[PDB]
Each structure stands twice: as C-alpha cells, then as structure tokens.
Curated annotation (Swiss-Prot), chain B:
Name the record gives this protein: Very low-density lipoprotein receptor
Entry function: Multifunctional cell surface receptor that binds VLDL and transports it into cells by endocytosis and therefore plays an important role in energy metabolism. Also binds to a wide range of other molecules including Reelin/RELN or apolipoprotein E/APOE-containing ligands as well as clusterin/CLU. In the off-state of the pathway, forms homooligomers or heterooligomers with LRP8. Upon binding to ligands, homooligomers are rearranged to higher order receptor clusters that transmit the extracellular RELN signal to intracellular signaling processes by binding to DAB1. (Microbial infection) Acts as a receptor for Semliki Forest virus.
Disulfide bonds: C1-C13, C8-C26, C20-C35
Disease: Cerebellar ataxia, impaired intellectual development, and dysequilibrium syndrome 1: An autosomal recessive, congenital, non-progressive cerebellar ataxia associated with disturbed equilibrium, delayed ambulation, intellectual disability, cerebellar hypoplasia and mild cerebral gyral simplification. Additional features include short stature, strabismus, pes planus and, rarely, seizures.
Domain called LDL-receptor class A: residue spans: 1-35
Tissues where the protein occurs: Abundant in heart and skeletal muscle; also ovary and kidney; not in liver.
Originating gene: VLDLR
Assembly behavior: Homooligomer. Binds to the extracellular matrix protein Reelin/RELN. Interacts with LRP8. Interacts with LDLRAP1. Interacts with SNX17. Interacts with DAB1. Interacts with PCSK9. Interacts with PAFAH1B3 and PAFAH1B2, the catalytic complex of (PAF-AH (I)) heterotetrameric enzyme; these interactions may modulate the Reelin pathway. Interacts with STX5; this interaction mediates VLDLR translocation from the endoplasmic reticulum to the plasma membrane. Interacts with CLU. (Microbial infection) Interacts with protein VP1 of the minor-group human rhinoviruses (HRVs) through the second and third LDL-receptor class A domains.
Shown residues within the full chain: 239 to 273 of 873
PTM: Glycosylated.
Subcellular location as annotated: Cell membrane; Membrane, Clathrin-coated pit
Domain of life: Eukaryota
Swiss-Prot record, chain F:
Residue numbers on the Extracellular membrane side: 1-311
Result of altering K156A: Complete loss of interaction of EEEV strain FL91-469 with host receptors LRP8/APOER2 and VLDLR. No effect on EEEV-PE6 strain
Gene source species: Eastern equine encephalitis virus (EEEV)
Signal sequence region: none
Disulfide pattern: C19-C122, C22-C27, C89-C103, C150-C263, C199-C223, C201-C217
Role played: Plays a role in viral attachment to target host cell, by binding to the cell receptors VLDLR or LRP8/APOER2. Synthesized as a p62 precursor which is processed by furin at the cell membrane just before virion budding, giving rise to E2-E1 heterodimer. The p62-E1 heterodimer is stable, whereas E2-E1 is unstable and dissociate at low pH. p62 is processed at the last step, presumably to avoid E1 fusion activation before its final export to cell surface.
Post-translational modification: Palmitoylated via thioester bonds. These palmitoylations may induce disruption of the C-terminus transmembrane. This would result in the reorientation of E2 C-terminus from lumenal to cytoplasmic side.
Record-annotated site: Interaction with host receptor VLDLR: H155, K156, R157, K231, K232
Residues of the full protein shown: 323 to 633 of 1239
Bilayer topology annotation: Single-pass type I membrane protein
Name assigned to this protein: Spike glycoprotein E2
Locations listed in the record: Virion membrane; Host cell membrane
High-level lineage: Viruses, Riboviria, Orthornavirae, Kitrinoviricota, Alsuviricetes
Amino acid sequence: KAGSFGDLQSRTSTSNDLYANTNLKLQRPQAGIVHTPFTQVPSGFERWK
Amino acid sequence: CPASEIQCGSGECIHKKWRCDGDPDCKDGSDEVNC
Amino acid sequence: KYKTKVPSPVVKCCGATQCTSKPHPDYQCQVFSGVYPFMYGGAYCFCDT
Amino acid sequence: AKCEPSQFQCTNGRCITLLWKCDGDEDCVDGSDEKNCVKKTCAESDFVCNNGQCVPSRWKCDGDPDCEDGSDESPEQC
Amino acid sequence: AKCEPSQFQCTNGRCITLLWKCDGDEDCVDGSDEKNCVKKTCAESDFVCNNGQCVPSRWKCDGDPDCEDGSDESPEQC
Amino acid sequence: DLDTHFTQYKLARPYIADCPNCGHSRCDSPIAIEEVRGDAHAGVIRIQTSAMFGLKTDGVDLAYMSFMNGKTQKSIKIDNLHVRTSAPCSLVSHHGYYILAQCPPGDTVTVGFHDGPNRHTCTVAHKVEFRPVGREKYRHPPEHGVELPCNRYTHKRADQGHYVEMHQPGLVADHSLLSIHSAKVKITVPSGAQVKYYCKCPDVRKGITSSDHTTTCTDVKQCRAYLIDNKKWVYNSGRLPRGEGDTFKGKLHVPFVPVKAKCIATLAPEPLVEHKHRTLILHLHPDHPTLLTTRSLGSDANPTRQWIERP
Amino acid sequence: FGLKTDGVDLAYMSFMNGKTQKSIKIDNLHVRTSAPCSLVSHHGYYILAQCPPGDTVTVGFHDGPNRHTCTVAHKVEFRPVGREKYRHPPEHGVELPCNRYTHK
Amino acid sequence: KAKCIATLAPEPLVEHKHRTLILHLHPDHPTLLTTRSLGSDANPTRQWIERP
Ligand SMILES: [Ca+2]
Ligand SMILES: [Ca+2]
Ligand SMILES: [Ca+2]
Ligand SMILES: [Ca+2]
Ligand SMILES: [Ca+2]
C-alpha cells in the first residue's frame, strides 16, 4: 500500500520490472512557470525505518 | 501568392513548409484541415 | 526508498497534445490546457490560452 | 496573456501594475518600465544645482554641498 | 610499514585504495598520489589541439574556440 | 587522469531553469537546484544544479565553473561557491551539475555563487535531517567512539554505474533576437545557430531561418523567436520544455554515488551498576538520547525497549 | 539607506560618524536572524528582508575595515498561511490570500 | 494583501465501509483535518495530523 512498507517492491535489486504504489498525482503548473509539480505519499520505507 | 503557397479562403497563404503541422496558420485552417 | 523521475514537459503552443500510456511504474500523464509559460527570454507561447 | 489597461506590459512579455510603470524601480527584469521616464519639476522654494538636483533655498550658500555638484556653494552662485 | 596488496602507499606513508592510485583527485595530502601519473590518449574522432587538448571533430572549425587557444578555429586548421 | 571523468560532461552545457526563490522572489536562476539527495547518515547531501562545476568552455578545470548568461555560456572561476541549509556547509567536492556538501539540519537548502558584483542564489524548501548511526542520537560526528557501518555519498567523481540522461535542448525562447529595425521586425540569427520565428500578424508567417530574416510584421510583440542550438546537450530537467522527436542524446554518469562507509558513533558513559537480590539496578547518565534494551535469556524474552534522554 | 549628503542613490548609504554625517556605498549590508536573510529592498530608515525564524535580529554593515552591527532580542516567527504549518514557501501549491510587506 | 503559495498535502487513500469513511492520511507537515455532519448536530472534529 502507498506510504506503507511495501509501497515499492522489486523482485531483485537489479530487476527491470518495478512495482510502485504511491498516490503520485500531477498538479497544475503555477501560472507562467515551466515546471512539473506533483504530490506523492512520503516513502513508506523511510516511515518504516 | 506563388505556387509555393496555398491561399486560404480567409486570404492568408499556407506555405508548403507548414501545410500540415498540427497548428492552423490561417483562419480557414486549410493546412490542418487538409492534412 | 523510491525516486520520482520527471521528464521535461511538452509545452505545445497554439495547439493541444494528448497523453499516452507507457510501461512505467505508477506512470502519470496529464495535459494542462490554458498555460502561458514564461522563460528567461520572455513569453514562451504566442497564444494566450 | 495580454493584460487589461489596468496593467502595463514590459517588452519581456510580463505584466506590471500600471502604478509601477514609472516609479524608479525596475519591476520587470528587462527594466522596460523604468527605461522610459521623465523628470518632474520642483517648487520655487527650492534651488536647482548644475546636475538638476533640487535643494531647499535655506540650504543654498550654507557652506555644505547639498547636491552632486557644488553649485549650491559655488562662488559664481553665491 | 606495508599496506594491503590492494592499496597504494603515498610517500607520506598513508595507505590509499589502489583504485584511487591515479585519477583526478589527490587522495593524500602529500600529493604524491598523482605525481607519477601518465596522460591518457584520445580517440581519433576527437581533434587533438596543439596545446594537448582534445575536442570532438564536429566542433572543429565550427566558429567557436573550443580549445584554450582557439586552435580548432585558427586559420592553420581552416 | 581527470579528463576521463568529464568525457561525457564536456558534451553538456549549463542551463537556466525556474528557481522558487532567487533571493526574495521567484526567477529563472542559472544555479537552479534540480534535486537534493539527503539520505546519507553524517549529514552528507548531494545537490544537483543547472550550473556546471569543474568545466570551462576551453576544457576541464576544477577551479572553474560554467553557467549560462542568457543565450551565451559564461565560464568563470569558482568564487565563494557556498551551500547553506541553516548554517554554512563545508563543500566536499563538486562535479558537473552536482555539488557535495556537509550540511547541518535545516528546513531549506540554499546554493549560490558570486560573479564579480553579481550574486546568484537559489533557495528550495527541503527538509535536511542529520541521521546518526547506531543507538545514540548524536547531533554531530563525534571525535571518538564506536566505528559502525554507514551510508555515505562518496567524494569520488568516478563512474560507479549510476547515470542520468542528457537530451537535445528544447526551443530556447528569447525575444532579444527580434528588433524593429526600419519599422519592420528583423530576426537576428546568432552565428552557427538557427532561429525559429512565429509571427501571427495580419501576414501570418512562421519557419526556421538560418540567417538574418526580415519578416512582414512591424511589431516585436507580434513575433516569437526561439534559438535552436544543439551544439551542447542538457539534462532532461523537469523545468525545461522538451524538444521535438527523440531528444535523447546520451548518458551522464552520476558522481558521488551512495556507498557503504564506516562512521564513528558516540559511546555513552559507562553505567553505574548496583546489585540486589534477583535485581539489577542501573544508573544511566547519557549525553544524548540513548537506547536501552533488555531481554530475559529464558523461554520468555520479555523484551524492554526505551530511550533514555536524561539521567 | 539609498541617501547620501550629495543626493539620492540606492547604491549609497548614510550614517552618523560622531557629529559628522558620513555617506558610503552599501558594502555587505546584511540582516541575520539565526541565519542570513535575503534583502528585498531598503529605503531611508527601513530595511526589508526575508528572514527565517530566530530569536534575534542582527543588522550591520561595513565601512572599509570597520564593522557596525546591532543585535536586538526579537522573536521572528514563520507564519504559514492556510491549514498546513509549512516551514518555507513551497515551490507549488494552492494560492491563498496573505499579508505581505510590499517591496515598493 | 498579497497571494502566497501554500502546500497541498498528499491526497489520502479513501476506503469505504458500512456507514464508515476510512482515511489514510500521510502528511508532509502538520496538517489540519476537520469534519462535520450535515445533520442537525454537526458533531465537528478538529485535529492536527503530523504523522501517518
Ligand atoms: Ca499549419
Ligand atoms: Ca517601476
Ligand atoms: Ca548647501
Ligand atoms: Ca587519486
Ligand atoms: Ca570549435
């Protein structure tokens, strides 16, 4: 689940198929600014640690 | 306008350089409508 | 801990673009219409909206 | 976008409140607002030095150079 | 004193990792780490400058001095 | 050799990108901070910027840095290059786009450099935390103690298998190319570059000109000019407009990769131990929040875990 | 700040040197509240700066080899606008009405 | 009076059960969560949520 221990899961540290479950949502760029703002649930691994 | 351009019904001439590139360059849109 | 990779946004002036699906973990794509971005050199796009 | 008559637009393409069009502060990085301006006059109670700086008459010939040039204290003036 | 087989002993006596034995950084204060290095060559696809620099061929005579002396743009080259 | 680490960085150039705080207000900063990596233990953080450090237009020199001054790339000696979060950070090393700094905890990360009378700074909101190693929450690496394994960003520039993609730069919008001239918008093309122009005056005209072109429109506001110059590539920054087609041109190795290292952790004072019938009495006088854990060696561990912050 | 005995110039500063008024170019004029503050603008007696939270407000300037500073006890707090106690202006978010000292 | 940018906390995960709303809140900063019933008794709730 997002923000939980298993938010990011990979079969091995060198695999090319990564499972990611975060509420990554793109926000509208601010008026007149070229940037890609986004909101996301803080890493569940850091939380677990 | 020379043969290198296509006159739109609005009166502007579509240059072959942008006869079809996604954005209409004349009020008639004869470029993107003619893609 | 995950890393959020954010490629350069496609700023289409005087027109519109469409998002497509890609095989990336938690991939997000959204088209924000009515932007009038400015760069160091001034207004990037001509059309207002 | 193009801005209402309540706002001034700099050559950079960005808009600045019309009250900021000429007030001595470059409000847009390009400086288009202050690049075009004109100086205002001063009351008859004030003296004007050679550089055009205004100073009150009570400061004229008082021994202190109250302007960029010494005209307020110049012998030719006093 | 002797270091591990996978280490390099600077003249200061301090052991350093053998991988660091020669690179851009002097890993020991004495600086003897890099004193004995040897300059690398560069691919033939890069125009070697007169003073020993080496820049890609596509930059040669491109209108911009990429070597520290402008050799790539000097009339001797084009 | 040193040049072997810049073989790919020589193909990239600095760029100007949006910075949330250029001192007092948002601006396009040549030192814009792209990322802050702060997961190392002893407060080591790696900051990725849009400026190039260790490269000059003429080659490699760790004393020099290169940054964009508008359309023109400027190369200057590093002067008072500093990193600040809540207090000045010690700089460990620097590499193209990357700065390695030793920073204390703080709510922000500020990067900036001086160029004569000019000052270029970029402050981003980013919680930098000090992560102590072990069972004691020390606030600064101690002089002496127990040496424990830790995660650190190595000071070495060498390629260790981590790369970032560098892409062909997108259209660089720059209105300084347009001039009214004889009341007739002229497009000035810098030598060796191409200028895309887009005018939507009564005579709608657009195209790519390689040389000075006089358009039919009479007002600069009616036209846009974008400089197309692919001599040098740029990182695919999320703050730069993407170019058309497949803009991918190469990979740039990530310097100062995270590595396992040995960190010195604090060693709490030795407890006073008093003995009673079937009872152990410990008098703990810690210097920093110190974790105390106990367990029985029988069939029931009955574990205890508590942080001791005061005697 | 911005005034000299000879006229007006935002690059110049004027201060009293005993009984004599001295005017110098602004040299390392700084504001510090537990950390350096970014200067917004200055006018007459007033200095506008963006300071992080701190217990003290330090103001000072240099005049050649001399350093003139003044530190006063004053709790400077960051007051986030809205329903979230953020510690620094975000790069992006919701634009909410707030009270600011204008730089003009 | 001016406009200041304020953070937007991450959108919570919303789970629905019989007559029950379950929110999983993962804020970045102390975030104020408030709720009220739309009935005759608002029974408002107000708490600052600092941790998940
Ligand atoms: Ca077209
Ligand atoms: Ca103004
Ligand atoms: Ca006088
Ligand atoms: Ca070495
Ligand atoms: Ca060249």
